[PDB]
Amino acid sequence: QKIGGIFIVLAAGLVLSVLVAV
Amino acid sequence: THVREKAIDFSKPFMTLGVSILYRKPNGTNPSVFSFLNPLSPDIWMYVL
Numbered sequence: 390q391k392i393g394g395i396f397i398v399l400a401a402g403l404v405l406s407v408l409v410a411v
Numbered sequence: 412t413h414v415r416e417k418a419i420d421f422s423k424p425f426m427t428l429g430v431s432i433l434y435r436k437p438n439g440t441n442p443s444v445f446s447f448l449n450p451l452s453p454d455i456w457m458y459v460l
Contacts, residue, residue, distance in 0.1 A: 392451060392452040392454070392455050393452065393454060393455045396458060
């Protein structure tokens with residue numbers, strides 16, 4: 390639809406913010 | 412009327428009227444908050460918080 394499955398980019402920013410530096 | 416004027420002869424009418432319409436009354440409605448999800452899909456709610 391248009392209403393579900395959009396949340397990915399903020400967790401991808403978290404991956405850049407936290408996942409990047411182990 | 413005319414086709415009865417053809418049929419028989421007429422003295423003055425005692426009431427001249429039309430057709431009208433008969434319908435009911437809504438007699439109230441039900442307000443929210445009992446639904447407020449209607450434009451949105453009913454699946455995706457809590458995931459922001």
